[PDB]
Design a binder for this molecule. Structure first.
Ligand SMILES: Nc1ncnc2c1ncn2[C@@H]1O[C@H](COP(=O)(O)OP(=O)(O)OP(=O)(O)O)[C@@H](O)[C@H]1O
Ligand SMILES: Nc1ncnc2c1ncn2[C@@H]1O[C@H](COP(=O)(O)OP(=O)(O)O)[C@@H](O)[C@H]1O
Ligand SMILES: [Ca+2]
Ligand SMILES: [Ca+2]
Ligand SMILES: [Ca+2]
Ligand SMILES: [Ca+2]
Lengths: 144, 372, 372
């Protein structure tokens, strides 16, 4: 349960509300406020809601949302950032996995207007390699 | 500016490459070969110890030893030869410039972790280092934070429950049969056709036969009956000296040792109900998503039909009031490396490295307090 | 009222006789001799092939072939000649009214087992037959029921652990190194003193030299130093053409291939490691009496000093609390035949006989179900 000191995590879960982050190349960027409630189909998202209780404590709820066209690095980074944001907190949050088109009814409950999806997204941070590939065509003269 | 290295040290197949890649750059078997004859043509590049895939190439004239057995490093000097071959010959990099991420088996003893730290910082002189676990990187590569992982490689089979991104040590269960024992059983049951494979050189041939021509039968008895009656599943293989062997009912009998350990005289449980025995050891509330997330990882999950058979065998003895789904990505033989490559390339990982000066004023004991 | 026949068909010798007797009536080597020169004198008694001792008495003008090479049967017409000779010429009995007990080495290819049935009911027309494991007959001949048998003859050398009268199939080990390989190695190392032996007749002579003048050294390096420092270990042998040869350290180097197989270039371990790993693959509670009941069988265990060397090597490998007893009866050359002779003569045995009726309603597959 080693804590992390990512500088964007310092503004997370301090006042009752709802916070959205997008994964762009192994990093989180908070999407602006008027782009809330709608998502790209090829990106991964981290969703936080914090709720004030009657007795004074402040509960937390993490979701991580994966589109049907997101790559492996975006979904894996979303899962690891969800875990690390739970560890930055004192383990008081419950995590949920959200898939595009098969969301929970409570996930539909957070957004007032509803969910609407666009094509496209930010490109993946991976670069393509194949294991054990050589493409070589040379000729050597040995002489002496 | 510099790029981290990921090195997944398997018991029979070591993977290595650079962080931020979608595939490992190098996959080569973790063997050390030593010569068994005398080199009479002197001055023609004879070495006292051939390491890695080169030792796989001239495997006839060598004796082969595995430095890692059952997931745990036992012979340490050969493991230094594996790491030296990995850094200098294979990846062709200086270890002084690159941070290095390593992976370990679950329930690793502490002394092996400290000794891994000591040879990592003293012998090769890395500037940073980190140790991770096989199954949690498999689950991160699957895009999940909660699930059971059946990681079955060459040495051991591990069932690891992970809840909220952390493993549960009271329910991690180790079953000690894998593709090495399947290979040995296939050498046992090829003797009745008249083919003999005795030394370690042609164990690799039997491993190639097991990889190319094996499948998991959905039902065993009717498959045996159709194998006995007809000859529609008998197929041929070409040995590298030119002889052609043919294999019939042994094509599907050899994966069945995972579901029935009594085929090799092992009194333990099959791979399907040890996951049930692991999931009964967990808390009652968390079993709903733990049954739904059945992550298969490792190279011996790459048989055709193993997912449908695993679905049937879990669905038989779990209660009928719940749904079971088995997931099997096509990259599951490299998934630990994929999770490590995602983990090393993050923007929150630069503070989680174990730097050189922290090891200098901490010794080989800071690896427990940081890799946790 | 009919007397059953017991016919142990080894790789180098055939031991045949009647059930209930104490010694086998016919012992003769399993060879087929064919002429290789030009016959110039007409009439007389020239035959196209000679079998057994008649081939040994005329071996100067014959090429000799063994039907059995390393346990498996290669030539079946020659093996039919061997069976015809041992029925009609040696035992001089008609085989259509005597049930015939046959013996077989374990981990044999299955295709021999029905094929041995396929001659016996079709050509000779025996009323019944049975196939038994050689190691359990050797253990029964010692009066024991639990123990480990090292059976080493002319073709193969196998370790079989037996508990409660049944062999454990997951711990039987086979080593393809026996008396013919030691004979070939002795032909190889007699060229160092200048003696050339290339003919199959000369192979028979070197086999005789190996039987008369070889022993197992208790420690190899001290015995080599003793043979280097003096000539007290040298012995003389007279060839049948009157030539006298002298052998020194080669007396004990030729049994040492049993304990160090790397002399003839094999990666596999010695017979004592084979016995130790055969014991180690058994259950933990029955290892106490496997070390204490270690019988030896076959003609290749007839060297002087083999039992003391075996106890020395097993004692160094076993834990010190264990008690080691190597059991070497003087009748161990014919112990397979004695166990078969007692086992066939019992009044309670006449329902395990595979008779003609179930064979010709079941085909050549009854031997896989009634003979375990
Ligand atoms: N297609 C395949 N079918 C069957 N077996 C396979 C296949 N591909 C690989 N294997 C086997 O999988 C094993 C290697 O898998 P993997 O690299 O995941 O294991 P590892 O990391 O070496 O082992 P471990 O995790 O136990 O230390 C070998 O035994 C290999 O024979
Ligand atoms: N006194 C002896 N010393 C050493 N070896 C012997 C001796 N007698 C027989 N042998 C070897 O035993 C082998 C045959 O053993 P045995 O098991 O009786 O026959 P088979 O192997 O045909 O069943 C022969 O190859 C022979 O070389
Ligand atoms: Ca994307
Ligand atoms: Ca939590
Ligand atoms: Ca692995
Ligand atoms: Ca024999």
């Amino acid at each position: 349960h080693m804590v992390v000191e990512h500088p964007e995590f310092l503004k997370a879960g301090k006042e009752p509300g709802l916070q959205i982050w997008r994964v762009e190349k192994f990093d989180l960027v908070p999407v602006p406020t008027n782009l809330y409630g709608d998502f790209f189909t090829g990106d991964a998202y981290v969703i936080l809601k914090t709720v004030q209780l009657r007795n004074g404590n402040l509960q937390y709820d993490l979701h991580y949302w994966l589109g049907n066209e997101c790559s492996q690095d975006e979904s894996g980074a979303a899962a690891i950032f969800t875990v690390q944001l739970d560890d930055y907190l004192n383990g008081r949050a419950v995590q949920h996995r959200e898939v595009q088109g098969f969301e929970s009814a409570t996930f539909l409950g957070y957004f007032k207007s509803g969910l609407k999806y666009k094509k496209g997204g930010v490109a993946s941070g991976f670069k393509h390699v194949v294991p054990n590939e050589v493409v070589v065509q040379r000729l050597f003269q040995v002489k002496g | 500016e510099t790029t981290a290295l990921v090195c997944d040290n398997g018991s029979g197949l070591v993977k290595a490459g650079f962080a931020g890649d979608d595939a490992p750059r190098a996959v080569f078997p973790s063997i050390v070969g030593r010569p068994r004859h005398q080199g009479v043509m002197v001055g023609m590049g004879q070495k006292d110890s051939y390491v890695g895939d080169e030792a796989q190439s001239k495997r006839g004239i060598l004796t082969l030893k595995y430095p890692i057995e059952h997931g745990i490093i036992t012979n340490w000097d050969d493991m230094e030869k594996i790491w030296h071959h990995t850094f200098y010959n294979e990846l062709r990099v200086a270890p002084e410039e690159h941070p290095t991420l390593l992976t370990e088996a679950p329930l690793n003893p502490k002394a092996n972790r400290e000794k891994m730290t000591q040879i990592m910082f003293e012998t090769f002189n890395v500037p940073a280092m980190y140790v991770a676990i096989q199954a949690v990187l498999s689950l991160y590569a699957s895009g999940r934070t909660t699930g059971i992982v059946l990681d079955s490689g060459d040495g051991v089979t591990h069932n690891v429950p992970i809840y909220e991104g952390y493993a549960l040590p009271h329910a991690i269960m180790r079953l000690d049969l894998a593709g090495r024992d399947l290979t040995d059983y296939l050498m046992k049951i090829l003797t009745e056709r008249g083919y003999s494979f005795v030394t370690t050189a042609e164990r690799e041939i039997v491993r190639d036969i097991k990889e190319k021509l094996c499948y998991v039968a959905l039902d065993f008895e009717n498959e045996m009956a159709t194998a006995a009656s007809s000859s529609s599943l008998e197929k041929s293989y070409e040995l590298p000296d030119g002889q052609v062997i043919t294999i019939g009912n042994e094509r599907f009998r050899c994966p069945e040792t995972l579901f029935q350990p009594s085929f090799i005289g092992m009194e333990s449980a099959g791979i399907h109900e040890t996951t049930y025995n692991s999931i009964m050891k967990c808390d009652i509330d968390i079993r709903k998503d733990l049954y739904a997330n059945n992550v298969m990882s490792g190279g011996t999950t790459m048989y055709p039909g193993i997912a449908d058979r695993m679905q049937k065998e879990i669905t038989a003895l779990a209660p009928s009031t719940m749904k079971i789904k088995i997931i099997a990505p096509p990259e599951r033989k490299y998934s630990v490396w994929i999770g490590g490559s995602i983990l090393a390339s993050l923007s929150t990982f630069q503070q989680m490295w174990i730097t050189k000066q922290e090891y200098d004023e901490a010794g080989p004991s800071i690896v427990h307090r940081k890799c946790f």
